[PDB]
Amino acid sequence: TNLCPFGEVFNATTFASVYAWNRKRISNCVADYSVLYNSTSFSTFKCYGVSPTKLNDLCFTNVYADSFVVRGDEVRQIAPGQTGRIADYNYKLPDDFTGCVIAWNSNNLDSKVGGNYNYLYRLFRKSNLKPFERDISTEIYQAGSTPCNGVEGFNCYFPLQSYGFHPTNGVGYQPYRVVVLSFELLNAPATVCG
Amino acid sequence: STIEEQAKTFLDKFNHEAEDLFYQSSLASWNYNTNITEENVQNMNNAGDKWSAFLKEQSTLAQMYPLQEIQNLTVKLQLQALQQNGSSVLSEDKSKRLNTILNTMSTIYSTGKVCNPDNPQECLLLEPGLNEIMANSLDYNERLWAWESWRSEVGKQLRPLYEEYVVLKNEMARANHYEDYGDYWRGDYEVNGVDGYDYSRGQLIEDVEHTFEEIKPLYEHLHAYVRAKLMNAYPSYISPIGCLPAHLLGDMWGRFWTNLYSLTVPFGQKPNIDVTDAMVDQAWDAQRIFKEAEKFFVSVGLPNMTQGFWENSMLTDPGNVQKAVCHPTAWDLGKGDFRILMCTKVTMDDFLTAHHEMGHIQYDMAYAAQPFLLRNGANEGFHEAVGEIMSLSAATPKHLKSIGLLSPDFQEDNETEINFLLKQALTIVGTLPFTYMLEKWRWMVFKGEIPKDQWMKKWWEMKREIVGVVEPVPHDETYCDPASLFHVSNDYSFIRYYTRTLYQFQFQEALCQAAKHEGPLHKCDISNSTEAGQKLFNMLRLGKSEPWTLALENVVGAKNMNVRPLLNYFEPLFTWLKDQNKNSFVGWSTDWSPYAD
Ligand SMILES: *[C@@H]1O[C@H](CO)[C@@H](O)[C@H](O)[C@H]1NC(C)=O
Ligand SMILES: *[C@@H]1O[C@H](CO)[C@@H](O)[C@H](O)[C@H]1NC(C)=O
Ligand SMILES: *[C@@H]1O[C@H](CO)[C@@H](O)[C@H](O)[C@H]1NC(C)=O
Ligand SMILES: *[C@@H]1O[C@H](CO)[C@@H](O)[C@H](O)[C@H]1NC(C)=O
Numbered sequence A: 001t002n003l004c005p006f007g008e009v010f011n012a013t014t015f016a017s018v019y020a021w022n023r024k025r026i027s028n029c030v031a032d033y034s035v036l037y038n039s040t041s042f043s044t045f046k047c048y049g050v051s052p053t054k055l056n057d058l059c060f061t062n063v064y065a066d067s068f069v070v071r072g073d074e075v076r077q078i079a080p081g082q083t084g085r086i087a088d089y090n091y092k093l094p095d096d097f098t099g100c101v102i103a104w105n106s107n108n109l110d111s112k113v114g115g116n117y118n119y120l121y122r123l124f125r126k127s128n129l130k131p132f133e134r135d136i137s138t139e140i141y142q143a144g145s146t147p148c149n150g151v152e153g154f155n156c157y158f159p160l161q162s163y164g165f166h167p168t169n170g171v172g173y174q175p176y177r178v179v180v181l182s183f184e185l186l187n188a189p190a191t192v193c194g
Numbered sequence B: 001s002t003i004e005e006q007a008k009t010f011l012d013k014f015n016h017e018a019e020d021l022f023y024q025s026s027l028a029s030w031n032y033n034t035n036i037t038e039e040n041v042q043n044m045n046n047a048g049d050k051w052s053a054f055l056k057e058q059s060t061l062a063q064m065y066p067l068q069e070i071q072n073l074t075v076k077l078q079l080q081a082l083q084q085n086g087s088s089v090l091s092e093d094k095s096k097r098l099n100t101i102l103n104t105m106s107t108i109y110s111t112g113k114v115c116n117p118d119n120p121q122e123c124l125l126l127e128p129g130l131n132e133i134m135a136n137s138l139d140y141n142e143r144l145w146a147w148e149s150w151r152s153e154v155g156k157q158l159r160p161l162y163e164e165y166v167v168l169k170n171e172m173a174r175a176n177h178y179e180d181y182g183d184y185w186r187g188d189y190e191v192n193g194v195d196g197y198d199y200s201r202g203q204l205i206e207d208v209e210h211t212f213e214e215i216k217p218l219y220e221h222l223h224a225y226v227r228a229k230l231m232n233a234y235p236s237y238i239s240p241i242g243c244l245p246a247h248l249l250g251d252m253w254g255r256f257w258t259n260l261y262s263l264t265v266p267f268g269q270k271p272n273i274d275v276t277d278a279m280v281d282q283a284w285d286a287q288r289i290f291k292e293a294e295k296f297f298v299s300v301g302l303p304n305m306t307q308g309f310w311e312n313s314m315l316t317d318p319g320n321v322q323k324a325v326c327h328p329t330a331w332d333l334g335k336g337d338f339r340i341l342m343c344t345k346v347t348m349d350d351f352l353t354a355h356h357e358m359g360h361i362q363y364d365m366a367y368a369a370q371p372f373l374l375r376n377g378a379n380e381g382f383h384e385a386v387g388e389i390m391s392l393s394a395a396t397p398k399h400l401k402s403i404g405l406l407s408p409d410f411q412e413d414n415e416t417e418i419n420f421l422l423k424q425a426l427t428i429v430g431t432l433p434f435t436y437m438l439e440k441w442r443w444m445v446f447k448g449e450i451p452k453d454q455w456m457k458k459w460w461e462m463k464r465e466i467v468g469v470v471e472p473v474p475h476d477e478t479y480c481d482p483a484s485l486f487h488v489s490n491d492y493s494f495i496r497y498y499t500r501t502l503y504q505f506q507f508q509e510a511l512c513q514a515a516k517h518e519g520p521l522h523k524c525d526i527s528n529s530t531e532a533g534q535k536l537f538n539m540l541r542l543g544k545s546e547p548w549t550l551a552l553e554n555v556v557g558a559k560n561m562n563v564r565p566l567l568n569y570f571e572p573l574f575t576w577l578k579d580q581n582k583n584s585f586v587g588w589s590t591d592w593s594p595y596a597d
C-alpha cells in the first residue's frame, strides 16, 4: 500500500533518447493520476479508450511508462495510426493503444546555449518497427546496392542524427519531453489500485 | 533500390544536417549583428565557413545522382537546387581569379571617394555625402559635378575588372550548359517538366517586353509631367521635348524618383498625411507599433507572432554602450526562430517598415513546413511583393482612421489622393523603365550582342530610348557607368524588382477583389477580410515547391505576369496627367543633349 514511483520517471534530471527510450515497470503500489491531470503544466494529453478521470477508479496488472525527448512538431506522431520518422523508425505505437502520452515543453531544462545534442533519433532504417519495439543497433544503413562494410561513403552513413536544441528555438523545435503510459490486461491479479 | 529512393534518402539526410548547420550560422551572424565586436566577426566567419564547406561537400555528393531518371517533381527540384556547382565548374586558378575580381570590385565600390581639387583633403564617401548631395541639393553644377566625379572615379577603375568578370562568368555559365550568365540568372523563372505551367528563359524576355510596352503610356505621361515641373524649377537646363538629365533624378543613378516630390508636388498647400504626431501624443513606442502591425496581420486571419519573436528580436536601439547594425531586416534563422532587427523610431515611415518586415516574417512562417531547400519565395520577386502589399494596405487614410492615428474629421478629397498617388508613382512607376533598361543591357552584354567597343554607347542609347534619361556629359568607352550601381558591381540580378513591382499590384488587386472593396484601388484595404487573407496564405504556404506560375494563379487566376492591376491602381493619376498635359508635350526625342550648344 505504497505510492507508485511516478516522481522518478517524471522528475528525472535526464531523459532517454527517442531511439533508445527507457521503459519503466511500475507495479505493487498505489497510483493517483488526479494530480497528474490537474498539474496543468502539460501541453498535450490526448487519448481514445479511457477518460483521464475514469482511469483512476480502474486498475490493471502492469503499467509501462516510456520517456523520451522529441521536437515540437514531432509530438503528434506519438499516437496510434500515425506515420513519420518517429512513428516508423523510432517509436511505433499500435492502433489498440489503451493509454495516452503526456507532453510538456522543456526548452529551459533540455536546451542550453549552443545546442543540447545529447538526444538522438534514428533517421533511416530498412523497415518500420513493430509496436513497442526498440532498435539500438548502429550499423551503417545501406541506401544503394554496393556493400561498404560499415564506413562513411556513397549511400552509406550513420543512421542516427542528434537533436539540436537551443534555448531560442521555435515552439515546433523545442525539446518536448513525452511520457507514454501504456496499459494492458492479462490473467494476472490486479496489483495497483486504491 | 532505384535512384529515386537513394535520392530521397540523400535529401532527407541533407535536410537534417543543413538545417542545424544553417541555424548555427544564422545564430552566430545574429549575435554579431546585435553585438558587433571582432570576436563576433571571427565566430560568424567560422560558422559561415563551416556552413559553406558542408554545402560544397553535399553538392559534390549530389552531383553523382543522374537527374534524367528522377520522376518526383519535388525531389527533382531539390536535387537541382543542390547540384548547382557554380564556381567549382572552372579550374582552380580561374576560380581564384574570379573571386579576386569580385572582391576587388566590391572593395572599389564600397571604399570609393571622390572630390574636387578645391581641397583634396576633406570630402565624404558615397553613402553619407554623395547620396545627400544627390537627394537634397538643387544646384545644377553641384549635382553634375558629383555625378561625373563618381562616374570617373568608379567606372574608370571597374571597366577592365568588369570586362574580365563578364568573360569569366560567361565561361562559367557555358561550362554549366547555359548560353550565358544572363541565362543562368533567368533560370530562376524557368519551369520545366510541368505541362501548362512551364516557362522557358526567353518567355521571360517576351513577358517583360510586353508588360513594358503596356506600361509605356503611363510612364510617358508621368515623365512629361515631371519634365514640366523640373523645367519650372530649372528654367535654363531642361528642354520642352528633350529627355531628363540623369543627375537631376533625386539620387546618384536615378533608380527612384522619390526625392522629386518636393519639386513635383501637385498641391503644395495641402499637407500630406503624417500620423507621427498622433503616435507621439498617444504614447506610442516600438512595442506599440509592432503590436498594431500584428493586430492588422491577424485581422486578415494570419497567425500572430510567436513568443520567441517578442523575446528575441531587437525592436529598439540597444543604447550606446554596444553598437549594432540595425538596418531593418526580417530574420529567418530556421528551426522556427523568426526575428526582426530594426531600430524602430516613432514615425510613420518606421510604422510602415514594421508592416513590411512583418509581412516578410509572415511569408517566412508560411512555408516553414517545406523541406530545407524549398524554403523560399516562388521566385526572387515574391518576398518583396508580399512585403510591399501590406505596407500599401497600411498606408491608406482609412486604416489610419480605424486605428485612431487619424481623426474622424479628416476630409479625404481628390487633392490629398492625387498627392499620395503621385508620391507612390514617383516611388514605383519611376523605377520600372530604369530596371528594364539595366537588365536588358546586362542580358545583351552577356549574350555577346554588344561588343566591348560599344558598351557605353548602347547603354546610353537604350537609356534615351527606354527610360527617357539623357546623360549630362559625353561618355566614351573608358567609362563603366553601369558598374557604378551597387547591384551591378556586386554581381546581383536586377529583374527581381520589376517582377516585384508587377506581382505586388497583381496581389493587391486580387485581394481587393476578394475583399469586395468598392471604389478606386489606391483607397483599398485588406484589413478585416479573412477571405483575402486566406487567398494570400494559399500562395504563401507554397514556398518554391510548385511552379511560380501556379502560385501566381492561386491568387490572381493568371499563369503569367499581368500589368492591368498597376494601371487600375494608377488610373486616377493617369486621368489627372491626361488632363494636365493637354497644354504640353508628352514624349521625348533622342537628338537633344544637355551638352549640345
Ligand atoms: C515533480 O516535481 C514537481 C515540483 O516539486 C511536483 O509539483 C510534481 O508533482 C512532481 N511530479 C510528480 C509526478 O509527482
Ligand atoms: C557583447 O560582446 C562582448 C565581447 O564579445 C561581451 O563582453 C559582452 O558581454 C556582449 N554583450 C552582452 C550583452 O552579452
Ligand atoms: C514526392 O515525394 C513525396 C514524399 O512524401 C510524396 O508525398 C509525393 O507524393 C511525391 N510525388 C510524386 C509525384 O510522386
Ligand atoms: C475591424 O472590425 C472591428 C469590429 O467591427 C473594428 O473594431 C475595427 O476597427 C475594424 N478594423 C478595421 C481596420 O477595419
Ligand SMILES: [Zn+2]
Pocket: B356, B357, B360, B384, B387
Ligand atoms: Zn523587405
